Amino acid sequence: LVLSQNTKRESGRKVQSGNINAAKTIADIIRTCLGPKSMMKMLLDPMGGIVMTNDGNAILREIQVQHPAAKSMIEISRTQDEEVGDGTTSVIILAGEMLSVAEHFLEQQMHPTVVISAYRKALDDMISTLKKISIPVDISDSDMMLNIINSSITTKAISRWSSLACNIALDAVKMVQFEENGRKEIDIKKYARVEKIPGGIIEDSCVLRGVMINKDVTHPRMRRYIKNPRIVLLDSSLEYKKGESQTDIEITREEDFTRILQMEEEYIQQLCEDIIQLKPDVVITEKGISDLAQHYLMRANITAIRRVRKTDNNRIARACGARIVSRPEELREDDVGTGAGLLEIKKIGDEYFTFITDCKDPKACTILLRGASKEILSEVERNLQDAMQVCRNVLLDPQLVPGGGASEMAVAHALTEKSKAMTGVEQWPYRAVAQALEVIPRTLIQNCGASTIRLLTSLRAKHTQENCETWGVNGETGTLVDMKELGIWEPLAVKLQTYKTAVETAVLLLRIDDIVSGHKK
Amino acid sequence: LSVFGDRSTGETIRSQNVMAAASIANIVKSSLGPVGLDKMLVDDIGDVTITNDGATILKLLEVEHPAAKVLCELADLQDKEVGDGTTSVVIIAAELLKNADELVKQKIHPTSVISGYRLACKEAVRYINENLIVNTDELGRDCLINAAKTSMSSKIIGINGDFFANMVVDAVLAIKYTDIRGQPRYPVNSVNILKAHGRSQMESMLISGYALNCVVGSQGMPKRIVNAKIACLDFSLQKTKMKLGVQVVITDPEKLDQIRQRESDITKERIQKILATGANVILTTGGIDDMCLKYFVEAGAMAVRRVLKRDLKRIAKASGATILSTLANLEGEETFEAAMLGQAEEVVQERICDDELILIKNTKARTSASIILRGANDFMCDEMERSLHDALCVVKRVLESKSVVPGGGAVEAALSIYLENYATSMGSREQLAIAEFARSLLVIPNTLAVNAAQDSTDLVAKLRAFHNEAQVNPERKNLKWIGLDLSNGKPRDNKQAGVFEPTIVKVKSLKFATEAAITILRIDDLIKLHPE
Amino acid sequence: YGRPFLIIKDQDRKSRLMGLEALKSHIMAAKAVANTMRTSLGPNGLDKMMVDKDGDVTVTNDGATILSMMDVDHQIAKLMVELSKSQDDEIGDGTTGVVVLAGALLEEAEQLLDRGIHPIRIADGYEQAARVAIEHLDKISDSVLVDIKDTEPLIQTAKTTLGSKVVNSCHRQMAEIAVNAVLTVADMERRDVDFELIKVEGKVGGRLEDTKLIKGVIVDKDFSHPQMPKKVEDAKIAILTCPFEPPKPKTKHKLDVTSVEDYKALQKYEKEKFEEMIQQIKETGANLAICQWGFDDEANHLLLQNNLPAVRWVGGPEIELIAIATGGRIVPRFSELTAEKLGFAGLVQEISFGTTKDKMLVIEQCKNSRAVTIFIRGGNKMIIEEAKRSLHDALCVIRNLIRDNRVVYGGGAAEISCALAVSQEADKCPTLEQYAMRAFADALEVIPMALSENSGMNPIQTMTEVRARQVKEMNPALGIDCLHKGTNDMKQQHVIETLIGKKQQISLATQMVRMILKIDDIRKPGE
């Protein structure tokens, strides 16, 4: 017994093949999942539930593996999925075939490292190529976004609900720009809360100018409906709290026990009049509520809600623009809930809901999802999740690309122009990537169900012409289609990270030459 | 006669130890040289780790045999000493073990072997200092580029090296530091490296300042500050306790309110005292209370909780802040002084990989450097920093030692022959160990070539000849040369190619292998003990 | 690279010991056997008792038997075991110490190993020392070739050879018992004698002194018919193989009787045949018959009907012992027997030897007979068994003496001179074989020390004096006063031994220890 006592090892071509095989496996289980003609997959969770989604990431997110590079690929998915949302509908699939041809030079006894070098060389050419054939666009023009929005969602089941979602997405993003960074304001996808409520229909689901609380009034008398509410966000609890420093009390005369009892009551009263002093209408706390305080707030005609998640609270704060407070005596009129167009508490059916909309200039809001069932709606928001995602990315970059394989062919021959201009051993790797690129539209045809070879060849033959760069494939016809009229248009950074991530996998995987298990630590 | 174990002696264990050593060599023999191929370990449950650097590899690998741990132990010191040579060093020792035993394998007296081995070590270093080339006449940045990009080979980032080392050299040159008043020492680990999966390393950015694996305390709190009013304070912020045992007993109730009142007002005024200075940025390894958060927003200031001490220690150093465990004075009162502030142009938290991290830009008091890593997975990132971690190390040593050695294995190429002739100098039986010591020392190019997959002997023989030729016709200014390549599979002038390595790398290496070989060879018998 | 691999199956349980550690290990094992045997030598020695796997027991002093009964597991031990077996059937006792010679040599041999000394030379010198021993030994050897009809050199030698055995109670008699036995059956024209001509016969009962050699043959068979008379004076003897039944040709043979007269003639023949051979033997004029095989109860009585006792179911070897002792022949046929082939003897008489048992038959032949038997009586089965082997062994040395009529007074004097003779060479030795000399010489010294220790005297105070006398005097006839007799003249003490006995003994030992030194490594399979 020598090395590690039941830790296996592997080396060389067997290893490299294993990764390639493991890689090749990873893509194909998803190769059907992309396109306007894509499939939609349903999954078995560990814990009993059901998830159905076309977004590959979640599918891969729910995948348990033993092969390491496979686990590597999994993480690769969520990173870009975190990064851009969609294209993971293609991201990994692009990687594996890149590898799939990549192995084709290994038996050529070609050291991968140099094959890596071309891969590096390839990327910059791709990056430069794409920028050349990128398309700047205005951001204020809403309808273009929606087409861009629709284009980005014309792969998911919300295709039939494109118009709403496109509006649904567009409005939500448009109202998110934290301008306190000068002219470098940032939107955030952590305030655009998504709320799934059962019943109703897609059409019933709509964007609400503010936030929703799945709670109910602590006391009946408080109005469930107010025109112009005034709001206080009380981070602190509204009731007596123990003296933190383990204080203790020894009374000697009779009255003190009752007296100290009144004193905490007074302390309660003490807090309230400070609140009523600012003429609020609304009491909000992430904590519980003294009913005795609640009594006086009821006396105050001031509505109170307790025990709310902080995340929503700040959004509530962001909704009416007011700022949260934990110090009632230090309450500031600058944090009044001014800018709440309406307070209401509705009934969805067995649940009270808090309506606070029509803010003057809401920066935060939550979307109310009304559909078929949460898992249906869970799919919906995932389509939303990306749907909002690319939009903000667009608000980062006004540059657009015709995806759908059109840019891809554009890249390919551009490299082919390079490859024949790039004599040397690395040339064959270089043209390999170009040829490797071609599979994504090929998938489309398989997803479409047409003559892939004939279509692609005509496609490639079409794009040998320098005059035309927007020739792509319609998803449903499976015919050569220039993109300008078809309108499937894509943000630059999306495909950027796509290629950007794609290569990083290979080189990372290409260096792999040995296996070691059993760390036991 | 021992319970719970037998023993092995003589050739048996002798041979056994060699097998142990060679195995470890074969463990890592594929991770070296500009063509090195990285290693990876499925741990036990899938938390795998790709890496090419042996010290990490060795450290992460379970070992049971003693001597292997010694090499495993040995490398880490070199890791604690160099950072690479992990590409090389362990391979050196066991090979030095390998041939050494072979002499012993007939009859050869080990201590006899040791002395020449001792002689081998001292002889080479002395000649290497007779083969050194100094960088000062050379342009600083260039060889800095060279050795780094030389270090960049065999790594994940070797292709992008020019961007990398260029980033690297700026990073280190900005982390200049004045040492003992007689040294301009450059502190390793001073630069901050944060891994951020996502964009490419092309998009990986150097931070001319400090960046934080931190986030804003309060969503209400501001996010970007264009000002330099920066405070740090180790003192955590909670409504204070009595903090030892100091019991509170009440006989007059009428005061608990004011007791309760003051429990936060102590914190409150401390904040206001802090705020009266006008510091708008505060950092705290300790916890931060929401009451302070509220006032801080009402102060509009910036607050950070739960930050690692090392970083804020670096923070005070660069910004010129004064690290403060508490407020006090040489008089009893807790006061605060603006002079304790640190200064930097702008501090922002920014979302990378959907994650907002806090940045500090351009501290006026002292230059700071951080490096942002963008990559595909966590797997790629945390390995690439290790190289980047090692990347600075050699530069520090290069900065530490105004002296360089050409890369691409010319060292032993020179060494092998010079001792080989010097072997004849001794005249004892020991020079045989020298010849093998040199003979074993030839290991490196062979290791490179097999990973590069060419005829090594012919390459090596060509290497031998040129260096041998470099030892004829003492008009060597037009006959002394240095260099070798693998990418073209032919020798060159790595001096012309810029393939350079820091001297001390080989220096300490040959020493450290010498000791270990000294250690392992002397053994003649192992005795095991079964556990209780 | 480094990873497990299989060279031999069960590589886990293939243990292996090599070199000096193995060497000494064998030495350690060897000494145990030596220490096992030390007590077993000499008149004052004490013998061992072995217990059989089937629960039987055996007490004995013959180390060959001791080891033959011994079940060791160490392989070298078995080499020692067969070693003694090789010596015994080669000579006989001396086995009383043969192995003891080896291991003490090996014990000290390690001392040279402890001096790092390579076995090969150690193999070398001891052999040279061995040759040194014999050429010294035979030079100082006495001879009994020079003797007249050797009546009582042998008696002394027998007396000597029996002093190591518990049968020493009346051993003088048994000494005479053997010497008569051997001289009768010896071929001086050949210098050999077959032990088959000797019939050992020991039946338990009676005293040891009741042991009595019989110039003749004794039969573990009684009379064919109980009414046949127990004694027979004249010894006209018939020796038969063909059992007294209808002959049957052993090729597949059968008759196919058909008619009445077919039945009758055979029925008629059936008796008629018996009368024929009954007539046939009667016409031979013999007095007694003996058959190897069966009888018919009918003709048996008819054989009793003519006062011609016979013996039925007689084992093979004995029948010829009968034949040769009678000088008689063996005839397979009734017709072909004639009086000339008949055996004659002095007396035949069955003996009711047991008080409560069936009986035995003895033939007190009175002419010359190249075969003979010894009858042993005594009180214990094992005591019989000890006697037989002891008696058996005593025969051999006289046979051994027959081969070579030159002997030496025993008692430890012989080899003592040798080491001295060895030692004198050790000065003219030159190098390291020089160490090898005194080593073996020192090795040889143990045997007297074994004696005196078994004598309870100071071993060293004894031999140190013993050497110096044999140093001061030139007479190599001073051994150990084993029975506490103030005379070291073992020649006068008559404790003597054949040259070959020791000669083969040590010479045997040398070759074995040579191999013993020769091996270094062992691979033992796990059980």
PDB file of C-alpha atoms in Angstrom, chain B residues 417 421 464-481:
ATOM      1  CA  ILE B 417      28.883  18.801 -17.722  1.00  0.00           C
ATOM      2  CA  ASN B 421      34.456  17.342 -15.388  1.00  0.00           C
ATOM      3  CA  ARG B 464      24.507  18.530 -24.111  1.00  0.00           C
ATOM      4  CA  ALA B 465      26.631  19.339 -27.151  1.00  0.00           C
ATOM      5  CA  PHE B 466      25.952  23.070 -27.237  1.00  0.00           C
ATOM      6  CA  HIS B 467      26.641  23.374 -23.536  1.00  0.00           C
ATOM      7  CA  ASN B 468      29.594  21.045 -23.984  1.00  0.00           C
ATOM      8  CA  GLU B 469      30.599  23.247 -26.904  1.00  0.00           C
ATOM      9  CA  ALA B 470      30.085  26.136 -24.514  1.00  0.00           C
ATOM     10  CA  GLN B 471      32.800  24.471 -22.425  1.00  0.00           C
ATOM     11  CA  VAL B 472      35.427  24.478 -25.175  1.00  0.00           C
ATOM     12  CA  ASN B 473      37.431  27.348 -26.666  1.00  0.00           C
ATOM     13  CA  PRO B 474      37.333  29.766 -23.696  1.00  0.00           C
ATOM     14  CA  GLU B 475      36.581  32.573 -26.105  1.00  0.00           C
ATOM     15  CA  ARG B 476      33.041  31.966 -24.886  1.00  0.00           C
ATOM     16  CA  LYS B 477      31.640  35.478 -25.279  1.00  0.00           C
ATOM     17  CA  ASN B 478      31.247  34.233 -28.842  1.00  0.00           C
ATOM     18  CA  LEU B 479      30.933  30.646 -27.575  1.00  0.00           C
ATOM     19  CA  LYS B 480      29.018  30.714 -24.234  1.00  0.00           C
ATOM     20  CA  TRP B 481      25.290  30.446 -24.800  1.00  0.00           C
TER      21      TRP B 481
END
